Amino acid sequence: FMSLFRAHLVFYRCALNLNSSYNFGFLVAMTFVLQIITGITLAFRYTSEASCAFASVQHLVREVAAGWEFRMLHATTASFVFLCILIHMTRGLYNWSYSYLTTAWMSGLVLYLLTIATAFLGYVLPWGQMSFWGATVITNLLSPIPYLVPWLLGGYYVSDVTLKRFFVLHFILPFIGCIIIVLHIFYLHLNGSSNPAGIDTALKVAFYPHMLMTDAKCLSYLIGLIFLQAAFGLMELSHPDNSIPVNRFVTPLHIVPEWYFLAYYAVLKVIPSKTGGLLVFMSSLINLGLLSEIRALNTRMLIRQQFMTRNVVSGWVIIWVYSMIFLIIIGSAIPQATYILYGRLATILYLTTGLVLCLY
Amino acid sequence: FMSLFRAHLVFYRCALNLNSSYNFGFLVAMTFVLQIITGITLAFRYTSEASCAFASVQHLVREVAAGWEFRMLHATTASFVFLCILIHMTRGLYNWSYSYLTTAWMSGLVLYLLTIATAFLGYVLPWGQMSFWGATVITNLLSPIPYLVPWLLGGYYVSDVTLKRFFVLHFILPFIGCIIIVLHIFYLHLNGSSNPAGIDTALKVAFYPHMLMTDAKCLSYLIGLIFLQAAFGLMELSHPDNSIPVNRFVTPLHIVPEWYFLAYYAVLKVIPSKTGGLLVFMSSLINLGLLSEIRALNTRMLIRQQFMTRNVVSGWVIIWVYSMIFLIIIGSAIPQATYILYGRLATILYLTTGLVLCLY
Amino acid sequence: SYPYYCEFFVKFPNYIPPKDPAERLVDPRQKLEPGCTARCSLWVNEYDACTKRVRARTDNKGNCSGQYEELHVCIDRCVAKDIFKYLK
Amino acid sequence: SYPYYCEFFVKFPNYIPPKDPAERLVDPRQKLEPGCTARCSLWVNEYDACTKRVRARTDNKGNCSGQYEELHVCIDRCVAKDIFKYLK
Amino acid sequence: EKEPPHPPSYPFWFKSLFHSHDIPSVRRGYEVYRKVCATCHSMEQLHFRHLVGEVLPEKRVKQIAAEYDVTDGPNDQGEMYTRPGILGDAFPSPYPNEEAARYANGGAYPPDLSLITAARHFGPDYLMALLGGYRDPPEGVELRPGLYWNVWFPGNAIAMPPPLMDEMIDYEDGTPCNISQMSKDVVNFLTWATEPTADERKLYGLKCVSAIAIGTVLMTLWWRFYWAMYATRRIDFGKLKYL
Amino acid sequence: EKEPPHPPSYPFWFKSLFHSHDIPSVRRGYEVYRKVCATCHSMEQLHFRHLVGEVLPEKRVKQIAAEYDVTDGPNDQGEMYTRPGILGDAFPSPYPNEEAARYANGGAYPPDLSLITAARHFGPDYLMALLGGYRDPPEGVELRPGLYWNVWFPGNAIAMPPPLMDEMIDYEDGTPCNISQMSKDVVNFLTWATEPTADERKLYGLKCVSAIAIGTVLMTLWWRFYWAMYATRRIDFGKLKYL
Numbered sequence A, B: 001f002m003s004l005f006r007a008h009l010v011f012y013r014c015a016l017n018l019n020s021s022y023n024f025g026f027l028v029a030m031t032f033v034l035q036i037i038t039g040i041t042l043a044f045r046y047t048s049e050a051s052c053a054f055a056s057v058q059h060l061v062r063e064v065a066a067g068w069e070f071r072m073l074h075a076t077t078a079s080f081v082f083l084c085i086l087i088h089m090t091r092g093l094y095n096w097s098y099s100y101l102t103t104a105w106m107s108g109l110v111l112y113l114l115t116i117a118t119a120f121l122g123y124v125l126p127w128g129q130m131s132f133w134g135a136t137v138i139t140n141l142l143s144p145i146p147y148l149v150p151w152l153l154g155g156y157y158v159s160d161v162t163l164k165r166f167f168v169l170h171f172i173l174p175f176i177g178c179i180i181i182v183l184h185i186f187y188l189h190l191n192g193s194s195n196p197a198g199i200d201t202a203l204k205v206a207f208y209p210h211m212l213m214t215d216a217k218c219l220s221y222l223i224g225l226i227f228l229q230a231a232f233g234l235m236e237l238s239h240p241d242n243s244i245p246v247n248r249f250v251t252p253l254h255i256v257p258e259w260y261f262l263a264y265y266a267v268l269k270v271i272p273s274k275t276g277g278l279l280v281f282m283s284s285l286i287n288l289g290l291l292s293e294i295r296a297l298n299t300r301m302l303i304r305q306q307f308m309t310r311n312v313v314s315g316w317v318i319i320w321v322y323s324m325i326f327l328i329i330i331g332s333a334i335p336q337a338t339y340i341l342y343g344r345l346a347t348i349l350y351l352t353t354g355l356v357l358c359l360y
Numbered sequence C, D: 001s002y003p004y005y006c007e008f009f010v011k012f013p014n015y016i017p018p019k020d021p022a023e024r025l026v027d028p029r030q031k032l033e034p035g036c037t038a039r040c041s042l043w044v045n046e047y048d049a050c051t052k053r054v055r056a057r058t059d060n061k062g063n064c065s066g067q068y069e070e071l072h073v074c075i076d077r078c079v080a081k082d083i084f085k086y087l088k
Numbered sequence E, F: 001e002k003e004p005p006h007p008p009s010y011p012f013w014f015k016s017l018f019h020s021h022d023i024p025s026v027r028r029g030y031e032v033y034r035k036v037c038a039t040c041h042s043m044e045q046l047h048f049r050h051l052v053g054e055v056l057p058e059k060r061v062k063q064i065a066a067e068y069d070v071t072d073g074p075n076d077q078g079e080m081y082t083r084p085g086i087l088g089d090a091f092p093s094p095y096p097n098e099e100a101a102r103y104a105n106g107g108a109y110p111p112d113l114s115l116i117t118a119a120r121h122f123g124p125d126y127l128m129a130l131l132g133g134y135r136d137p138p139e140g141v142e143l144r145p146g147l148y149w150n151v152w153f154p155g156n157a158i159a160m161p162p163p164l165m166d167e168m169i170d171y172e173d174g175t176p177c178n179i180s181q182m183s184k185d186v187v188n189f190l191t192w193a194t195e196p197t198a199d200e201r202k203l204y205g206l207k208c209v210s211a212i213a214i215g216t217v218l219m220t221l222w223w224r225f226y227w228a229m230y231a232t233r234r235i236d237f238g239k240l241k242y243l
Ligand SMILES: CCCCCCCCCCCCCCCCCC(=O)OC[C@H](COP(=O)([O-])OCC(O)COP(=O)([O-])OC[C@@H](COC(=O)CCCCCCCCCCCCCCCCC)OC(=O)CCCCCCCCCCCCCCCCC)OC(=O)CCCCCCCCCCCCCCCCC
Pocket: A019, A020, A021, A080, A083, A084, A086, A087, A090, A091, A094, A196, A217, A218, A221, A222, A225, A321
């Protein structure tokens, strides 16, 4: 397995002009490994009982040596997982990477779905108000089929049984992640990476000396920033309301998911029919999947240059990003008619600019 | 990975005269896979709290559909894991497999150590009297080094913290098992299996049609027997005393480990010095390890035929087996002078007949 | 783990009716005990022997709990053969 | 999760000694309130306006909690600048 | 210390491989347990839910549960109160904690019987023997007050008084009461209570094992089918012998 | 519903990146909490162990704990009893259950303060504002009895009475007592109690971030070291130009 190590991470030859925007994959992998370490060492002292989970998490912070550090590293590294993934996705929307990296793009989408599931399962385990009512909402959202929801819950309502199986599932999924990562990289190195210029070039250079050092530099920056936020708390990434014990008969008066879930939340606020809601997610994900075979949707021969530099027309990916940010903004606010109106405007933009990527 | 599947499990060519005694590896692997399935589905409803673990295991049996079946399959398949492993080891002591399957034999030993550890960790999780006092004994046995025992316990005595980390460790170790199994098979197929006759032969035959069916037949028998014992309870494999809740200030009046641990227990009964006790285990395992390079311990050219058929002299492996069975017998009984005397006789036999394997 | 373990070839008695509806207001064991008492006579012999010797030795320490235990284990293991014929 | 979040470039006051040991048996807020009351006069204006109009409309529904809330938020946000200079 | 003796094997209806529990005996054993043994023991794992359809009809079980006061709350004022038991409640217990139980029983602790036959050697045979086992002391032995001699209890001296007495209880089916009969019926009841899923387990076992054995025959035939083609092969060196 | 206003930022000593907690303020806040706020609230997560060496000397903390009766047992008779508190015991609570707490407070539940500043927006600034916030109703609004108007509580109507009163408590260091001072000191105390590991966390943070930044400079230099050899390379086609 050493010979493979050398073939793929030492003698592998890249293009000279790979700048930082091509370093974020490595970064998400590293946040995965790190999150796994802190996960396992948190599991050694966590209690999976509805009667006492909350106090179990508080015991780590209050009465255990370095107890606070692992919880906070685990909490904060999640945000960086998602931030790095979104940068990593947008880079390849910008470049039209999926033109020839077909199966890599598919694998990517599967990994993103895995990550969403993993995060949301994690989000229930500390067992506060937000956890209980979030679980209630998302389980009610997948109700269309009889008996599936009491079965997956384990029970007529969110329960200790639900906590136990969420804990086991959150244990298992990351490692399935890892396996799919190996699959991802297989498809990638089958083809070879693209340039920022989107041309084919013979001016290649080996990995170990030049690109490995850039990977290391960015890694230093990321470790830095994680520790800064973890130790000092600069930003209010997580809302305070998960600090309150659960009550099964009273909701919290103000509700804000974790930031990486706000856009979705915005949709659930503005579309009238609940099924329309769910179908928007399904449709957008199907549209992203459809990009894998964009070469077939037209008989003009395709190029990877999108000529977005100096261009007054901008590009659909940029409009997508700004629409998504606008949806995050509206996600965060209270339900009111005007917020809903601009919500619907932004939603139409978000859907249309995704549909239109296929129309070259 | 399909091409590898075909190369190693379909077109791989064996010797014509491989009888059932060469089918038990496959069997232990299958008990591993099966034990993993039942493990995971038991984890979904188990509670890792000293205050309530016991009742958590009782809830599965009393109030859950098919609750009883998974617990009992998991409990009974362990015995078959160990029985198959011991048959599998004795076969290769009998044949002198380690003459040329050097690294396979080493890997085997590591897997057996892994299995012992896994089983013993499992044995504590139901949290009855025998579990608590067994954990106490084995943790006191590895005391020679300061602070290592309170550290590994987590605490000054066996505690809920100990349960939590035992549960996580018992979760993890089997999969490390699986990885080492892949390593095992690599070393094996690097060389190729031996015959019962211990000759080299060209009368080979492919695997898929002939030997695959024998594997399947034995698999049927084993599934049969597991279900027979699991559903009807023919043999008292496990003592009743783990059915009593724990008391930290009162021992059970009669003590009998699980059968696959009795021989070890016998030693701890009969050797006066505690360190002598531990050193006997260390020494015997080192002796078994030493067999990997038996070709070097002498300048006479070696053969695999031990000529044990019709032989009035028998063989050291058979004396080893009978000594071990005698030690199990004495393990089971109360501490009394005469049992200890025949214990010491059997112990001397067990040690000497292991030392002597190197003296060809 | 199991409540009990299966036994092969057990013999299950037919309920011998009492000859008088009043007949089993008294414990059926009393009707099986004499025979077994007669069968375990050697243990009675040894218990009485030990009783005598203990009462004699005069150094003021002795007991015959062993032989007593053996006597009653014998009697019980005899009674167990027929007791369930008289119970519903 | 955190008890608080860090704020950049905060200014920390020096404890202005009371001119009389008895001087702060009375709440220092009382000495900062007048100035801020004068600074937030537009909210007083609008609150009195709404009070008049509510008392006039005669259809018997109305209130001026909005403007009141704004008035007092203004006054408090003014007081917060100097209150910690008078506390140890 | 000593090796304790082993009890004789009684022919309980259940200890055959094809037999179920014997439900009339279970009813009578439950009646004995309620009237006698529940004075000092507990079964914390049992709820009345368990008796309907398996042993008793639902109506009667509700009426049984109604005989007890069970504590519940808090109420609007944060106080606790007592109510009549319902089908969903666990069996009641005579002592609030282990310390009180020991205080009432001269220091010894009456064990919880929810798993008693699975928590002793030879299970029901041991329990049947133990309930018969009370006898006078042997020559040379005397026991301190509140302690009794029993020929089947380990070390022979036990804290539980002689347990059974004729017509100390009565049966609703009409069966006559005596200590032997009560022994049999209560041992039956406790053996059932140790694992109510027994009959389900055994009836499923039978189907499973039978089908798997038929399987085994079929696979044996399939394996021999391929054995025979190489076991009967001919290999010649130099020239052909037979054809 | 409405968007509630946002509080002003007060210059608490701790909210700088280099500052610790301010321990005299913490002592005074603890004294306020004991004399006033512990009448209806609870801190179930705090034990007296937490105060020694961090806030108070051990001797004084033992003497504080001795002021309370704490329940313990069972004893030999299985009864419960009361004893003087010890350093190992958690803070006492005024109500036995949530139902009694609601019964005493007209239906509302006084929350446990063990994490209060981490369980609200703007934490200590919100709490400081709230304790100042009591005012007379506006024109056109009236509140039912046992309910009060506060300009910083969401929806403006709150069940907690006006909280503070001058010289309702007294200080041992000599500081004068008034509602503003009590507000500052108790908010300091509760902010500390929300996470006593704060100062450890920050002091470790500083070392970590500083060293990591120095790292980053070194790695930047190392990366440029290799950048320059290919950024400055010459490639010619056909014939050599320069040397
Ligand atoms: C600087 C950038 C930093 C990026 C960070 C990203 C975030 C990371 C988060 C996760 C953590 C990862 C950590 C590693 C980060 C990377 C590090 C790195 O190597 O950076 C390389 C980076 C750029 O390298 P490069 O080789 O040029 O990269 C290639 C380019 O990308 C060019 O590539 P290309 O040309 O091939 O293009 C491909 C394309 C590919 O496409 C993409 O990649 C697009 C991706 C877009 C993001 C999409 C996802 C978004 C998802 C939503 C996220 C929401 C978050 C919400 C957060 C809210 C926060 C409030 O990319 C682009 O098109 C990018 C161009 C975008 C232009 C946007 C222009 C915006 C203008 C804004 C003006 C604002 C004016 C404000 C005025 C205000 C007045 C009041 O260089 C540096 O950072 C240099 C080092 C600088 C160090 C300075 C340190 C100073 C410290 C001072 C201390 C002072 C102390 C004082 C004390 C005093 C005491 C007295």
